[PDB]
Enzyme design. Sequence first.
Site: not given
Ligand SMILES: *CC(=O)N1N=C(c2ccccc2)C[C@H]1c1ccc(OC)c(OC)c1
Lengths: 306, 306
Positions: B41, B143, B145
Amino acid sequence: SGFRKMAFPSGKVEGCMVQVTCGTTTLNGLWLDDVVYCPRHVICTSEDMLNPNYEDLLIRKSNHNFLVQAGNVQLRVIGHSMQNCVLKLKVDTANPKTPKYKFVRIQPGQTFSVLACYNGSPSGVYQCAMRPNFTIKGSFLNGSCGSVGFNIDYDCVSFCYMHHMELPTGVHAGTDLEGNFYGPFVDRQTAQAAGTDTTITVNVLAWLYAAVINGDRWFLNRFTTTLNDFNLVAMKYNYEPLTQDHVDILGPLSAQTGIAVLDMCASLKELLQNGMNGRTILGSALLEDEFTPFDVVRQCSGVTFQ
Amino acid sequence: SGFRKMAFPSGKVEGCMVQVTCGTTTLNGLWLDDVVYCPRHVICTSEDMLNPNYEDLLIRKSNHNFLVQAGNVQLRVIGHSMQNCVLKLKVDTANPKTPKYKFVRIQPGQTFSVLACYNGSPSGVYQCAMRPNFTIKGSFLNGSCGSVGFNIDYDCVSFCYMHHMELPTGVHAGTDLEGNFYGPFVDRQTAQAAGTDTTITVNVLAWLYAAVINGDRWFLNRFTTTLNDFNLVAMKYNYEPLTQDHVDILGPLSAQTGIAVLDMCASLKELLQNGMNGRTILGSALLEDEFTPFDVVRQCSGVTFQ
Ligand SMILES: *CC(=O)N1N=C(c2ccccc2)C[C@H]1c1ccc(OC)c(OC)c1
Ligand SMILES: *CC(=O)N1N=C(c2ccccc2)C[C@H]1c1ccc(OC)c(OC)c1
């Protein structure tokens, strides 16, 4: 979201751990630049530990009596000295993996990560607090002496603890990196009493703020209190008294959650007198005091390091 | 003595974390040999997360659309592919710090260490268990992930988890390193239910053995029980049923302490029906299930790693 008792990444410290042998005893040592630091009782036999004369014992030792090993690399000791309760071994090679570092003497209530080591090799890492009576409630077996506690700020490793002994009560005692014990302890196998242990109140409050940030709000009540009124209840339950410096440190958490420090004290006061009634806070049925206000901010804001 | 929730030393993993950027989103990636692994993603915008067609989204991307950075060193992507829910980015440079490693898919109830990272940089390390419903109760912010979970055996790093999402309930879900989710989850921003969470009974028993080893014995009782009788009580309290494989795994702890597995079950049965009466075990007022039998043996015997 979520809240965990997390330790610092240990990579920068793993590269500094060595094995130190003198005679038959083998301990861990810390290798920074061209100096190795280790507990001075490495020069003791099992018989010497009851009443060691460290000066007389160190006289009978020469540079070639110390064997320092970093994995399979062997260091040559070219000079030794005793600074308080630590030995400083000068070696011919400077550690290429030496990080930016400093030596710090922490205060009771502060937290740090311990890298538990055996024979110079890392076993695991955990977070703990210096108790108000200058012990730590760690996890250490025979041979773990010389393991170090540390914090990381920016790119700098601040070493603050070296493990020296387990008390007959099963708690642990050690020194700063200049060899001064924390607390009234001596490196001798004799029954030694630690004082009364108290709960670190400013840390408990920081943890209640963490709980609010993460959705646990049931303990918030309608009451308020004064600083003098709270400290009277706190001392009855063996809690450290709260001062103005503690209120100042909690300022940012108050700002983020909109809950005044004194209002949080009133919630804590009710928890002390009434218990928790089989409920939990952040998955715990006891009040937790091993998170400083800085630990909460760091974890809830995502602070990173080198 | 002492007992702590200790994590593995993270040094070997710190050298594998990189930052991965595609368009506007920046996540963590894992750099082993000349391949970088990261959640797929990363190729999504905020609008795409509601209902992403990953195949159609990946078509619009070319090798030069991915920016991979290791500190200040920049990697060049020379090939990309999608394996289930992970992206595999082939880069021109092989990671010189690649450790001996393998990819493993763990079972619920097993434990591992998580290295929480932001922008490719380590923030902290903690130990946790895979819940019976295939979630973890971690500590993750936006962030994080791409952060990975791992175990260390001998000199080998076994990667078992990559973090992908936080559920609306505040628990966490992710994949193995081949990109297969643990549990029934999908990488989409939609309300998803996790099943009933149960307590990992074999882990609780391992922790009671740890408590006996360290001096907490008050909970030992005169009764005994049968396997069928215990499992009947366990299921009423949402505990996993105990099988013969679990009894076999606890064998060494039984041998060391002299307490038969079924006798320990009888102690646990009494704790389930009668509570703990304001007493604690290893400093906890709840029954702890995040230590496997192997974790106890490792901590109580001083197992080290490379
Ligand atoms: C874990 C992570 O960094 N992120 N997870 C995301 C996600 C959202 C919905 C369903 C599955 C996975 C997106 C991503 C993420 C990265 C960075 C930010 O802010 C800088 C996020 O804000 C919500 C999300
Ligand atoms: C921590 C550690 O390794 N050791 N602590 C020791 C000590 C004993 C009494 C008072 C102060 C400090 C001695 C040393 C030690 C090393 C190795 C073993 O077994 C291999 C020991 O066994 C008790 C002790």
